[PDB]
């Protein structure tokens, strides 16, 4: 009886195995835009993905992960609120059964159709598994998706999904350029938080872009054909794989703009 998003093992149950679920810096959160304060000390974000080397795409039973070679310092995130440098390890999405839900963060209670998470670990801790044990171990860049015009740079991802339908399937996925998933503006909100799935560790500096990307209805429809189950098990569509907003508690959300 492992955790998931289903009728009986979803977010409201996670605290029994992972009591940090009720902690002081859980994610996601609602971003109340009027109260977030512009911080003139914040720096432009520096996203340097020109050497990013993707390897593989994996259906892990929760989402699909596009994995990167993180053995050389390529594909790094720095600046913004961060001290030091963070190396890209993977990206994944969260999405809904319906276009009206799917994001983890919300903006004045608005839910987007989906949310992309680009996960990076702080190189001062040597690898990902040590970084997640530190309060400044990860930086996750979050990007909202709305349904409208297709995102041309997303299509290669969409088209490989039929080959990783079920939990535990992977496929080779080289030469994918994540720059094609970025919006025009790098204006952002930032706050200290957590992983949004078990083990829910409080190790993340969140950087959530204000500008959403547009993807087409057909692109997001193909996300929703994935399955949470493994091959040869009854079909459970991979939809609604998002954790709801959690209490902000003693945190401030800062804006890079305005
Ligand atoms: N949302 S998260 O960044 O905490 C997260 C995941 C959430 C859903 C499914 C796959 C996920 C993969 C992650 C891998 C590394 C760090 C965070 C990850
Ligand atoms: Zn995520």
Coordinates of C-alpha atoms and ligand atoms in Angstrom, one line a residue:
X1 CA 0.0 0.0 0.0
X2 CA 2.5 2.6 -1.3
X3 CA 1.8 6.3 -1.9
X4 CA 0.2 7.7 -5.0
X5 CA -2.5 10.0 -6.3
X6 CA -5.4 7.4 -6.3
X7 CA -8.6 7.2 -4.3
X8 CA -6.9 5.8 -1.2
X9 CA -3.2 6.6 -1.1
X10 CA -3.1 10.2 -2.3
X11 CA -1.8 13.5 -0.7
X12 CA -4.1 13.5 2.3
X13 CA -2.6 10.1 3.4
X14 CA 1.1 10.8 2.9
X15 CA 1.7 12.2 6.4
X16 CA 1.3 8.7 7.9
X17 CA 4.5 7.4 6.3
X18 CA 6.1 10.8 5.9
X19 CA 5.2 13.1 8.9
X20 CA 7.2 16.0 7.4
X21 CA 4.1 16.3 5.1
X22 CA 2.8 18.5 8.0
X23 CA 6.1 20.4 8.3
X24 CA 7.0 24.1 8.2
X25 CA 8.2 24.5 4.7
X26 CA 6.0 22.2 2.5
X27 CA 5.3 22.7 -1.2
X28 CA 3.5 23.6 -3.3
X29 CA 1.8 26.8 -2.1
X30 CA -0.6 29.3 -3.5
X31 CA 1.2 32.4 -4.7
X32 CA -0.8 35.4 -3.6
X33 CA 0.5 38.0 -6.1
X34 CA -0.6 41.1 -4.2
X35 CA 1.3 40.1 -1.1
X36 CA 4.5 38.7 -2.7
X37 CA 7.0 41.5 -2.3
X38 CA 9.3 42.8 -5.0
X39 CA 12.8 42.2 -3.8
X40 CA 15.3 44.5 -5.6
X41 CA 18.2 42.4 -4.1
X42 CA 17.1 39.4 -6.3
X43 CA 19.1 38.8 -9.4
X44 CA 18.1 37.8 -12.9
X45 CA 18.0 34.1 -13.2
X46 CA 20.8 32.5 -15.2
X47 CA 19.7 29.4 -17.0
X48 CA 22.5 27.8 -19.0
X49 CA 21.3 24.8 -20.9
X50 CA 23.4 25.1 -24.1
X51 CA 25.4 21.9 -23.2
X52 CA 22.5 19.9 -21.6
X53 CA 22.8 16.2 -22.5
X54 CA 19.5 14.2 -22.1
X55 CA 19.8 10.5 -21.8
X56 CA 16.5 8.8 -21.2
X57 CA 12.8 9.2 -20.4
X58 CA 11.2 7.0 -17.7
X59 CA 7.6 6.4 -16.5
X60 CA 8.3 6.0 -12.8
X61 CA 4.6 5.3 -12.0
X62 CA 4.1 8.9 -10.7
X63 CA 5.1 11.0 -13.8
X64 CA 7.5 10.7 -16.6
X65 CA 11.1 11.9 -16.0
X66 CA 13.4 13.2 -18.7
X67 CA 16.9 12.5 -17.3
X68 CA 20.1 14.3 -18.0
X69 CA 23.8 13.5 -17.8
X70 CA 24.8 15.3 -14.7
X71 CA 28.4 13.9 -14.5
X72 CA 30.0 17.1 -16.0
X73 CA 29.0 20.7 -15.0
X74 CA 26.7 21.4 -17.9
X75 CA 23.2 22.6 -17.8
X76 CA 23.2 24.7 -14.6
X77 CA 21.0 27.2 -12.9
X78 CA 22.4 30.0 -10.9
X79 CA 21.7 33.6 -10.0
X80 CA 18.2 34.5 -9.0
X81 CA 17.9 33.8 -5.3
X82 CA 20.6 31.2 -5.4
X83 CA 24.1 31.2 -4.0
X84 CA 26.4 29.0 -6.0
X85 CA 25.5 26.7 -8.9
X86 CA 22.9 24.0 -9.4
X87 CA 23.1 21.3 -12.0
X88 CA 20.2 19.9 -14.0
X89 CA 19.4 16.3 -13.3
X90 CA 15.8 15.8 -14.7
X91 CA 12.6 17.4 -15.5
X92 CA 9.0 16.1 -15.2
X93 CA 5.4 17.4 -15.2
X94 CA 2.3 17.4 -13.2
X95 CA -1.1 17.6 -14.9
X96 CA -4.8 17.2 -14.6
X97 CA -7.7 15.1 -15.9
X98 CA -9.2 18.3 -17.1
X99 CA -7.7 21.5 -18.5
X100 CA -9.0 23.4 -15.4
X101 CA -6.6 21.7 -13.0
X102 CA -3.1 20.0 -12.9
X103 CA -0.7 22.6 -11.5
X104 CA 0.8 22.2 -8.0
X105 CA 1.5 25.9 -7.4
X106 CA -1.5 28.2 -7.9
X107 CA -1.5 31.9 -8.6
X108 CA -4.2 33.8 -6.6
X109 CA -5.9 30.3 -6.5
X110 CA -5.7 29.9 -10.3
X111 CA -4.9 26.3 -11.3
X112 CA -3.0 25.8 -14.6
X113 CA -3.5 22.8 -16.8
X114 CA 0.0 21.5 -15.9
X115 CA 3.3 22.4 -14.3
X116 CA 6.9 21.6 -15.5
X117 CA 9.6 21.1 -12.8
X118 CA 13.2 21.3 -13.9
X119 CA 15.2 19.8 -10.9
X120 CA 18.7 20.9 -10.1
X121 CA 21.1 20.0 -7.3
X122 CA 23.6 22.2 -5.5
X123 CA 27.1 21.2 -6.7
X124 CA 28.6 22.1 -3.3
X125 CA 27.1 18.7 -2.0
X126 CA 28.7 16.5 -4.7
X127 CA 25.6 14.6 -5.9
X128 CA 21.8 14.6 -5.7
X129 CA 21.4 12.1 -2.9
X130 CA 23.5 14.2 -0.5
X131 CA 22.0 17.5 -1.7
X132 CA 18.4 16.4 -0.7
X133 CA 19.6 16.1 2.9
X134 CA 20.4 19.9 2.9
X135 CA 18.0 22.9 3.2
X136 CA 19.7 24.5 0.2
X137 CA 20.3 21.2 -1.7
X138 CA 17.9 21.6 -4.7
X139 CA 16.6 24.4 -6.9
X140 CA 13.5 23.6 -8.8
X141 CA 12.4 25.8 -11.7
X142 CA 8.6 25.6 -12.1
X143 CA 6.8 26.6 -15.3
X144 CA 3.1 26.7 -15.7
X145 CA 1.4 25.2 -18.8
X146 CA -1.9 26.6 -20.3
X147 CA -3.8 25.1 -23.2
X148 CA -3.7 27.1 -26.4
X149 CA -1.0 27.1 -29.1
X150 CA 1.2 24.1 -29.4
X151 CA 4.7 24.2 -27.9
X152 CA 6.9 23.0 -30.8
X153 CA 9.8 22.2 -28.4
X154 CA 7.5 19.8 -26.4
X155 CA 6.5 17.6 -29.3
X156 CA 9.5 15.3 -29.2
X157 CA 8.6 14.5 -25.6
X158 CA 4.9 14.0 -26.5
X159 CA 5.7 11.6 -29.3
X160 CA 7.9 9.3 -27.2
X161 CA 5.2 8.8 -24.6
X162 CA 3.5 6.0 -26.5
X163 CA 6.7 4.0 -25.9
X164 CA 6.6 4.4 -22.0
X165 CA 2.9 4.0 -21.4
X166 CA 3.2 2.0 -18.2
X167 CA 5.2 2.2 -14.9
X168 CA 8.8 1.1 -15.2
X169 CA 9.1 1.6 -19.0
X170 CA 12.0 3.7 -20.3
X171 CA 13.2 4.8 -23.7
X172 CA 16.4 6.4 -25.0
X173 CA 16.0 10.1 -25.2
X174 CA 19.1 11.9 -26.4
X175 CA 19.7 15.4 -27.8
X176 CA 16.5 16.9 -26.3
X177 CA 17.0 20.7 -25.7
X178 CA 15.1 21.9 -22.6
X179 CA 15.5 25.5 -23.8
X180 CA 12.5 24.9 -26.0
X181 CA 10.3 24.6 -22.9
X182 CA 11.1 28.1 -21.5
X183 CA 8.8 31.1 -21.8
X184 CA 10.0 34.4 -23.1
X185 CA 10.4 36.1 -19.6
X186 CA 12.4 34.8 -16.7
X187 CA 10.4 36.9 -14.2
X188 CA 9.8 34.7 -11.1
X189 CA 8.5 34.2 -7.6
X190 CA 10.7 32.4 -5.1
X191 CA 10.3 30.8 -1.7
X192 CA 11.8 28.0 0.5
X193 CA 10.0 24.7 0.3
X194 CA 10.0 21.0 -0.3
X195 CA 9.8 18.1 -2.7
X196 CA 6.1 17.7 -3.7
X197 CA 6.2 13.9 -3.5
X198 CA 7.4 11.6 -0.7
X199 CA 9.8 11.8 0.9
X200 CA 8.7 15.5 0.9
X201 CA 12.2 16.6 2.1
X202 CA 12.5 20.3 2.9
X203 CA 15.5 20.9 0.6
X204 CA 14.2 23.1 -2.2
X205 CA 14.5 26.7 -3.2
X206 CA 11.5 27.1 -5.5
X207 CA 11.7 29.5 -8.5
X208 CA 8.3 29.7 -10.2
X209 CA 8.2 31.6 -13.5
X210 CA 5.3 34.1 -13.9
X211 CA 4.9 33.6 -17.6
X212 CA 3.2 30.3 -18.6
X213 CA 4.0 28.4 -21.7
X214 CA 1.2 27.4 -24.1
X215 CA 0.8 23.8 -25.2
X216 CA -2.0 22.4 -27.3
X217 CA -5.0 20.5 -26.2
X218 CA -3.6 17.5 -28.2
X219 CA -0.3 17.7 -26.4
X220 CA -1.8 17.6 -23.0
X221 CA -4.2 14.9 -24.1
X222 CA -1.3 12.6 -24.8
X223 CA 0.1 13.1 -21.3
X224 CA -3.3 11.9 -20.1
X225 CA -2.9 8.6 -22.0
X226 CA 0.0 7.5 -19.8
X227 CA -0.7 5.0 -17.1
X228 CA 0.2 4.8 -13.4
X229 CA -0.1 1.0 -13.5
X230 CA 2.5 -1.4 -14.9
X231 CA 2.1 -3.5 -18.1
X232 CA -0.5 -6.3 -17.7
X233 CA -2.2 -4.5 -14.8
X234 CA -5.7 -2.9 -15.0
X235 CA -5.4 0.6 -16.6
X236 CA -5.3 3.6 -14.3
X237 CA -4.8 6.7 -16.4
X238 CA -1.9 8.9 -15.2
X239 CA -3.9 12.1 -14.5
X240 CA -4.2 14.4 -11.5
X241 CA -0.7 13.6 -10.3
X242 CA -0.5 17.0 -8.4
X243 CA -0.2 17.7 -4.7
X244 CA -2.6 20.6 -3.5
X245 CA -1.3 23.8 -2.1
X246 CA 0.0 23.5 1.5
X247 CA 0.0 26.1 4.3
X248 CA 2.5 28.9 3.8
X249 CA 3.3 29.1 7.5
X250 CA 6.2 31.3 8.4
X251 CA 7.3 32.0 4.8
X252 CA 7.6 35.0 2.5
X253 CA 7.2 34.7 -1.3
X254 CA 9.5 37.2 -3.1
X255 CA 9.0 38.6 -6.6
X256 CA 11.9 39.3 -9.0
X257 CA 9.9 41.9 -10.8
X258 CA 7.8 45.1 -10.4
Ligands
LIG1 N1 7.9 17.5 -7.7 S1 9.3 17.1 -7.3 O1 10.3 18.2 -7.9 O2 9.4 17.1 -5.8 C1 9.8 15.6 -8.0 C2 8.8 14.7 -8.5 C3 7.4 14.7 -8.4 C4 6.7 13.9 -9.2 C5 7.1 13.0 -9.9 C6 8.4 12.8 -10.3 C7 9.3 13.6 -9.5 C8 10.6 13.6 -9.6 C9 11.6 14.3 -8.9 C10 13.0 14.0 -9.1 C11 14.0 14.7 -8.4 C12 13.5 15.7 -7.5 C13 12.2 16.1 -7.4 C14 11.2 15.3 -8.2
LIG2 ZN1 7.4 18.0 -9.5

